[PDB]
């Protein structure tokens, strides 16, 4: 069969495809997670400064910043509610990228394969990496939760 | 009519009671499959090198299954945090319907419950997100480590 | 003609050392002090529920508690292996002030030993907060103990 | 079951035993590590005390007896940690002992287990609770000895 060289073509053009589709998701989800993050340290640091003012005090700012806490709430859930729907859409991308590099493997490409899974253990490191970082900014948030319940 | 309205607040927060300890277990049980999803890649980070691909193939189904299990424990405690909002709702309705016509002392009982409630919560929510912490922890370590090896 | 400089360059470099691992330590022992105050917590919150429960509360705030003490312990762990490290810093920073004043770096010497004892009671400082809060500890211990039998009999 | 109830009898009385037996010894053991750290914090006292007029025979004198005073402080202190594990041990054995008099029907055993673990513990925690106090004592002691 003559079709065997010209699959490898067309398999790299799909490998580099789904690379590129996977740098663009990434690179989005990457963006919604700091951006849920950096909501999760502020909601933090209003819930410390509440706590804060619990003791010989009156009604007028321990109500206004709870009214702000429920704003920066929203903006907490509705940053996750972001994250969310952007995760599926990188699986995806990497679920495509995954399937890429088996077929490049499978017609002989190989070297499109070996990019293909370099490229997705970078990406998955890069993403974690930042999800850490919302792991340990949503356990300080809920320790700030728990100091406020007093 | 306080009758009515103590009735409403001791009902609610029986519920409350029960919803909140049904999710309390869906939370440590979502936790123990963190734990033993991190476990398993800490081991499966520590066999390579020694290892070549059968060992390392066996651990990895392992690993598809904690996470099946680890997700599937996710949905469950989802579902039953919906239900437990509206068990806290409810209550706090019901301390608000206690505090108008009057029924002071099943309000303050009722917020007193309410507020006992989100800090047992919010204390098995904290080791979850202590777990979580550590799953993503090792996961790094694992994939640092294959890029190497 | 010199030795000064280079004896002055080793006591910079180790006092830069000793500064990073006294700050590492001296945060592992705050998060190893607020994980005990965390768990005593728990403690006078399961002894404020002894007597009208049912073992619902009783049984989660002690799942709880078991967590609480698994994370005790590993903070434990944790400022115990940074520790040794500063053992070697705080050796290093002595070796190189007594150093600074055998080849007469008068002033080199002078100052890394007040930043050595500086250190030492930074470091101390915490320990006993540690103290403090460990026996805050027991004794949550053992007044839920205490209210557990007076329970029962 | 004609028969069983003896044998988990036998692992009853005999895990008591041995709890009470551990129980005693890690007493001694914390008590005996807390007079250590006593008279370690006395010697802290007695070095600052001296700082100043004094010259530094005597000072070096005392300081030489912390150097000791501390290596039988951790000796101590390590005995201590031992025997404690061995203690965790023996409580496991009678609160799973008081497991399985509970499934078999004992039970009247197995209160006297429970009630017997807390008492042990309670025992423990007293004791602990004073080297605590001690050992925050002794960090005071250090720091008031910071050179002054």
């Known amino acids: 069969l003559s079709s065997e060289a010209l699959m490898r073509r067309a398999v790299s053009l799909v490998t580099d495809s789904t690379s590129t589709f996977l740098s663009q998701t990434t690179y989005a989800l990457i963006e919604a997670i700091t951006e849920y993050t950096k909501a999760v340290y502020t909601l933090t640091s209003l819930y410390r400064q509440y706590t804060s003012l619990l003791g010989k005090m009156n009604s007028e700012e321990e109500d206004e910043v709870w009214q702000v806490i429920i704003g920066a709430r929203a903006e907490m859930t509705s940053k996750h509610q972001e994250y969310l729907k952007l995760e599926t859409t990188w699986m995806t991308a990497v ?3 995954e399937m890429a590099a ?6 002989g490409a190989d070297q ?7 490229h997705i253990q970078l990406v998955k490191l890069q993403v974690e990496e930042v999800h ?4 340990k900014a ?3 948030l809920a320790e700030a939760q728990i100091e406020e319940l007093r």
């Open 95 to 97: 679920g495509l990228s």
């Open 102 to 107: 088996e077929a490049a493997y499978q017609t």
């Open 112 to 118: 499109a394969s070996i990019t293909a899974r370099n």
């Open 138 to 140: 949503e356990t300080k």
């Open 132 to 135: 850490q970082l919302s792991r």
